[PDB]
Ligand binder design. Structure first.
Ligand SMILES: NC(=O)C1=CN([C@@H]2O[C@H](COP(=O)(O)OP(=O)(O)OC[C@H]3O[C@@H](n4cnc5c(N)ncnc54)[C@H](OP(=O)(O)O)[C@@H]3O)[C@@H](O)[C@H]2O)C=CC1
Ligand SMILES: NC(=O)C1=CN([C@@H]2O[C@H](COP(=O)(O)OP(=O)(O)OC[C@H]3O[C@@H](n4cnc5c(N)ncnc54)[C@H](OP(=O)(O)O)[C@@H]3O)[C@@H](O)[C@H]2O)C=CC1
Ligand SMILES: NC(=O)C1=CN([C@@H]2O[C@H](COP(=O)(O)OP(=O)(O)OC[C@H]3O[C@@H](n4cnc5c(N)ncnc54)[C@H](OP(=O)(O)O)[C@@H]3O)[C@@H](O)[C@H]2O)C=CC1
Ligand SMILES: NC(=O)C1=CN([C@@H]2O[C@H](COP(=O)(O)OP(=O)(O)OC[C@H]3O[C@@H](n4cnc5c(N)ncnc54)[C@H](OP(=O)(O)O)[C@@H]3O)[C@@H](O)[C@H]2O)C=CC1
Lengths: 382, 381, 383, 382
């Protein structure tokens, strides 16, 4: 005679306490790691600050901006106390607060170097957004300062902590595509000069470059970790409508071709004049991987294609096997510290992309191939 | 060819800039305080984490029968430890004005009593689905809400899910033409070892099987997609008699309904088959496929015609609408703040319970059950 | 060392020269041994079947049977059929005098399947008959009896039994990729247009035998059966049609039926004459869920096995054709069955089973009570 | 008081003749235009011959083959009169048969010109497979011979008669994508030297080139008809594993990028060492078009993408609004001759591709950009 299992039969029919429920998504754990967010801009307020909620070891300790009115408003929304609101002048004072373990620099590309360096002098860990800086030299000075302060330097490569991108790298390493031979990337988005956030991006001094530096870097970096190797030479070409006021100083569209030591090739482009595009294609001799969206803030989708098949993968509809890229990025530094472990996106990684972006820019300017076989080594893997 | 003024006027040195463009819901305030009742699977996996994205809501207190757990959860959400209640002193919430409403996330059979006690404590009530395990209990919850002059809202997250609302919108815009056939399926493998599932296998606590638990999504969904109520239902249920999970509640049940407009629907719910959340709405111009239809995340809808499949889902960079969980929480807040009725009132929850009761009767007797009792959806679907 | 070209490439002449038979990436024509007499030059015959012969590997059109001489003459010319090989419904029986007519393919209104199938067997021919088999269980049996008496094969036109994607779906299910099966859902619909000549007999119960269930719901019914690989033991149903709609005065528009199988699996499906194109099947197991959509299209079928975080889709390739199209395959299947003295996958008994089940479903809808269908049908040769 | 409509009530209950039925797919009409198929190879026997069945005005009249035994086998399979089987020596005798309206050259690239010219001298129209020829000069010779015999010259660009490709061109011209700015193409497939058909493809003298001449041309030609304009300059690079016996004479992978007079850019590639890929992407400032499969023999699929939307189109599941590309291509020449109209894919169109391919190879060899602003005008649109 079929009867209910023990567990079900033991459940009281009256109000009673029960055990900790099964977890189907990352549960909050602690808030030991305190960050100091610098630059309350579009990315900071739209993605990063809201991203702390899901963190399992991170919290917002202080804010840093030149707009006190805004800073006050953003502080009240995140319970940050007014007393811990720094401006770009007193920033160095963060040194007097041991509760500020690290700083997260979300300022224009040109101001990354200086504040990162000032942050290390203040004896703090540094989370710096990409592109690292607007010059290779500055990246090195950022790295030296990191070593000197004996703190960690991490670049905001969210995709290195995105579930779907991680799944993509895994299937590739498992040889589901076979011998890799051709990678294709495209990253685009219509430039709106009226958007406060986009205005400095049109300034060569502030941005360091056009679409490549801002978004093309996703195809560049992605080609590198998807392939799991570095380019030995690059060739490129760029074109911008001469009559378009948006590109007087920075490039609109640029295309770059690369060759790797394994024999694999790649061709990708970035654009400021075409609508939303984030697509990566990795061709092997067994199958072809299509990541589309490839690097979105949300809804990434990948597919392994073979004649007659399209095996798609995306985040589940009810469970959450891994944390979102933002919250995961924030906790990755926090964890690297408390565990005395190297970071997956070290300053050396961000410097590699800057060097590569310069070799690419130089290739487009000269119209000749630029050797990039300078022996960079990815510590810890891709 | 010169650079725009805005670009040219941006300083080369560190300086303050204006409030950035918002591409997703920004936090605004935390004026509506909630007392969360029942630190279970839904509370800790979806609800509490959903407060962060709210624009007018916050966690003020916790109500639990497990002291150690309550402390751990309170610490994780910065909840004042002195604001942790148990099921005995729950009534004392009446003394804290910072507690605007309560959110009942307890087993179905306990919804009514804690909802009514909450109204006597002068609080607004947010209660999870299914509303209750009897039509009479639903009514009492409603009588209590009116006596206390407080709002009663049932946890129909799909009533605040972007994709579901987009689905309702195109249907109302007549993109499918004349509606004639809806198909629904909601399923998931019942694991009797999961503490959260244990009470679901008990008739006294659950009030029913898969229909009361997840089939209700198809039922409720069929109603808001067609934008009308069923006037007749038929159904059949079957469960493996040797499976210990279904000794008291149904595993699989199939229900068929007819609407005044002439539209028909057939749907099912299952406790023994893997994850399924699929809705289909056939019109004479196009067919809508929602799959996933009612997920926590990743919903996807598609309007299909010969040679075309127009899919819609949440964007990859922008977020034009708040997630269903945060939106649901704020909806009660805003309704109270702005003196407006809620989209998912107690009457809506009660309609489902009555219909579910009718479906069970139909499956029991094997005869059709008339449901043409004139229910009116206040404020639309 | 340094690479050199392989022998094959190095041996290719640089001048015009004959080469070997090429690699095959699609079914190649082979012969035209099996001759068909097509009965009823209507919508299905002219849009799908006659054109479907070109892709066959053993079948050909030998003669035509039509009641419209003007039309038969035109079609005969389009397919190179001997003008003398055109029969009408009166001299039909004379096909017995032509040895090059191995079989007939009845593509007539449902109510006329039985008599022409029987006249064909008496004419000593094999028979391919469209679905639904007939309009009465008794007539189905009369067709089977006539086949047995003539010692000829009887095959029903279940094209999906020879459709690549449907076979792929059946295969992954048998491989247990979905786990234990518990819930099947089907929907088959298309807007009925009474001004279409082909639909006019479908609105007449005497000619059609029934409404949407008999016409297209049968795909959901038959599909549930070969997807689960078993037979229902009981059915329950309900039907409804706008009482003021002239299309449904004699046959049903929408009908919903649910069934239970001996394995314990359940199913709920529907067919509709008033909603647009729908051909969707879903099979839920405790390990995965299969979604076939399109499920039974003339073309472009697509299937997907879904699990949290995954959707593995399968469809016909873009450059190769691993298996022949369902129409050509169906036709060749009877041909090969005769030549190799083997039974067909879709025999008269299979078609009769659906007709019995459909009658049971209509009965259940009419009485509002369940109907026991545990009558012991056994699928010879598997599903 | 509902009653049945006239049509239904008038249907006899006994066997009776009925009208012509509604057409839901292209119906056969006539077989007035006769072809002589030259070269019974992989494409001919797998796609072209089987493609005649779906034609509305075309038929196979004769076969030209160097393999007499294969020719007789194929002849019997298609009801071709045994006497209508020619070989490469008596090929010119087709001039004596008025039933042969045209020839279809499905021979190796290097032999196209030769037989097309002999066909024109034979007074026949000519359908010739792509790539047109292995030299620009040979392309012109074919055109000259066409004009000399006053017969039409059409190149086998099936995609110019493929429903989905046409649908893609139509929506672009309707401005559903906005201002076009970036096109990406990829056409790949694993080269198998054991396949008799691929053996001449590895011979430069017979192929004229590697993957670009064979399948890259789809991306090239596609970029042109999707943009609806011509490139004014190209840049390219190619690489092939030096130890692979497959690429001793022809290239494996080649990447090319182009700039158009409208300002639009493009970057594509073709590969002989990676599995099945046929993907076209067209980015505008309003939407992005993804064609994938882009140029398949079957199952093409297109999708217009915008944030939160993916509107896909493909061939219906029950109706066939337009004929398949193969039958359509064959009928296109037939209709053009019968209606005294030019063909959508004239010799000049095939020649443009060959010239552009020459420019791309030249650009790959010199590592310098090549100007292609030579004034080609698409007669009749793309
Ligand atoms: N990894 C990713 O996904 C993304 C990374 N980013 C990166 O984040 C960084 C910030 O970009 P984003 O948020 O989009 O841009 P914003 O223009 O919106 O913000 C820049 C912020 O830096 C501060 N700032 C200091 N000096 C200046 C100055 N002279 N001009 C403009 N701003 C100044 C401002 O803070 P305050 O006004 O408060 O004083 C402002 O909030 C960039 O390095 C960018 O590459 C951007 C988007 C996504
Ligand atoms: N809308 C949606 O998407 C969903 C809604 N729900 C609904 O939420 C409610 C709770 O379900 P769920 O969180 O999954 O289940 P759980 O079993 O995980 O939790 C029920 C909670 O209520 C408390 N409780 C009080 N008395 C009992 C009792 N006698 N037996 C069991 N629990 C008791 C416990 O909290 P404590 O230990 O702290 O005392 C327990 O954690 C149900 O009404 C369900 O239908 C569930 C999932 C999704
Ligand atoms: N398996 C599949 O995918 C499909 C199967 N079918 C089946 O094919 C059969 C024919 O249907 P379909 O082609 O669509 O329909 P049609 O109405 O278009 O044609 C029926 C044909 O049979 C002949 N006929 C003889 N007597 C009659 C009569 N009294 N009334 C009407 N027609 C008559 C006519 O041919 P003639 O004028 O030359 O004498 C007529 O063209 C049906 O059994 C149907 O179920 C239909 C569609 C798809
Ligand atoms: N548009 C499309 O989709 C496609 C177009 N093509 C084109 O069709 C043409 C033929 O290629 P394909 O069918 O694949 O290749 P094959 O190698 O399979 O066949 C070439 C045919 O031409 C004849 N031939 C004469 N001389 C030679 C020779 N010296 N070497 C090889 N063959 C010779 C042979 O016919 P016989 O034995 O009878 O004498 C042979 O079967 C090419 O120009 C190719 O680019 C190819 C694939 C697809």
């Amino acid at each position: 005679a079929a009867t209910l299992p023990a567990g079900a039969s033991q459940v009281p029919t009256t109000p009673a306490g029960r055990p900790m429920p099964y977890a189907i998504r990352p549960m909050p754990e602690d808030r030991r790691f305190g960050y100091a967010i610098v630059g309350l801009g579009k990315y900071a307020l739209n993605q990063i600050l809201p991203g702390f909620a899901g963190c399992q070891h991170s919290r917002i300790e202080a804010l840093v901006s030149g707009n006190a009115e805004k800073a006050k408003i953003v502080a009240a929304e995140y319970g940050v106390d007014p007393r811990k609101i720094y401006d770009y002048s007193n920033f160095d004072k963060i040194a007097k607060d041991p509760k500020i373990d690290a700083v997260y620099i979300i300022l224009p590309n040109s101001l990354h170097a200086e504040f990162a360096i000032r942050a290390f002098k203040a004896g703090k860990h540094v989370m710096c957004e990409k592109p690292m800086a607007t010059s290779v030299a500055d990246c090195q000075r950022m790295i030296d300062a990191a070593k000197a302060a004996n703190k960690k330097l991490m670049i905001g490569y969210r995709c290195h902590y995105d579930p779907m991108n991680r799944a993509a790298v895994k299937l590739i390493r498992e040889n589901q595509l076979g011998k890799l031979g051709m990678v294709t990337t495209d990253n685009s988005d219509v430039m709106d000069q009226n958007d406060p956030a986009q205005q400095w991006r049109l300034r060569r001094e502030l941005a360091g470059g056009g679409s490549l530096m801002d978004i093309g870097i996703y195809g560049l970096n992605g080609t590198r970790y998807l392939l799991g190797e570095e380019p030995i030479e690059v060739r490129a070409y760029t074109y911008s409508d001469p009559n378009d006021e948006r590109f007087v100083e920075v490039e609109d569209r640029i295309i770059w071709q690369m060759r790797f030591r394994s024999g694999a090739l790649s061709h990708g482009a970035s654009s400021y004049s075409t609508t939303t595009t984030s697509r990566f294609s990795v061709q092997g001799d067994k199958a072809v991987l299509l990541m589309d969206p490839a690097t979105g803030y949300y809804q990434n989708l990948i597919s392994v294609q073979t004649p007659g098949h399209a095996n798609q993968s995306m985040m589940p509809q009810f469970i959450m096997p891994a944390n979102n890229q933002f919250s995961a990025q924030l906790d990755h530094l926090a964890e690297a510290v408390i565990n005395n472990k190297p970071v997956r996106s070290p300053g050396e990684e961000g410097m590699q992309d800057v060097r590569l972006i310069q070799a690419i820019y130089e290739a487009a300017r000269t119209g000749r191939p630029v050797n990039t076989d300078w022996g960079y080594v990815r510590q810890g893997g891709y």
